[PDB]
Design a protein around this ligand. Structure first.
Ligand SMILES: Nc1ncnc2c1ncn2[C@@H]1O[C@H](CCO[P@@](=O)(S)OC[C@H](O)CO[P@](=O)(S)OC[C@H]2O[C@@H](n3cnc4c(N)ncnc43)[C@H](O)[C@@H]2O)[C@@H](O)[C@H]1O
Lengths: 112, 114
């Protein structure tokens, strides 16, 4: 089954794209929780981190390196926070794996 | 074997921690000030001070930390969900300068995530 992030990948609805490569896409979150807030997602449809397999390991890694590179290109030099949410306790909204990256203000602890 | 931080001492077994999993690239253990009914860390044995200075060939390793995180989550019973977090720098609230992934669950996590 398909999601909104699928449509973003297929270019079927607009998003402000920060970065794209053959295996992932980064773009601005539509409901930002920080002055800068974006997502990195994989093009491959993994519905959630709990069902990712051991050979997805390079791809998940790639999402984080892309995250921190986009963070640096977006001027986030005081810091940032990355998050991945799983399932209803973790507050996962879209069932296509994704990495949040937030910064531009002081983040607080605990993180939800 | 792991750096001049507290996490290094954990890695070298110089101070105790409640270890959940260990392999040649990484170590997961229970956070000492838990912010959730289950709260642990996954760290790499390699000393990377923070995610901002990780290099392109660390990619497989950062991956591995997440796959361990989620394996451990499943072994610890966290089948309703959980949250993974990496902090970078002072805005991100990082304070041990050795890269680490938090994993939290056992209750409803909130938005925004700090
Ligand atoms: N020993 C440990 N075992 C398991 N988990 C641990 C741990 N030490 C920290 N953690 C976990 O890392 C997580 C956060 C990642 O690290 P942070 O950078 S965001 O903050 C924790 C760190 O301890 C902050 O240091 P700081 O707040 S400036 O402490 C002030 C001084 O107290 C010292 N100190 C800390 N723990 C101890 C201690 N157990 N005995 C003596 N001195 C200590 C420390 O060396 C420093 O000079 C926390 O949730 C925490 O529960």
């Amino acid at each position: 089954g398909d999601t909104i992030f699928g449509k973003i990948i297929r270019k079927e609805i607009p998003a402000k794209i920060i970065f794209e490569d053959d295996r992932c896409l980064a773009f601005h979150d539509i409901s930002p929780q920080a002055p800068t807030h974006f997502l990195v997602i994989p093009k491959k449809h993994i519905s959630q981190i709990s069902v990712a397999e051991d050979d997805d390991e390079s791809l998940l890694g790639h999402l984080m390196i892309v995250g921190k590179k986009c963070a640096a290109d977006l001027g986030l030099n005081k810091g940032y926070r990355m998050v991945v949410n799983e399932g209803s306790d973790g507050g996962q909204s879209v069932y296509h794996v994704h990495l949040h990256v937030l910064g531009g203000r002081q983040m607080h602890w605990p993180p939800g």
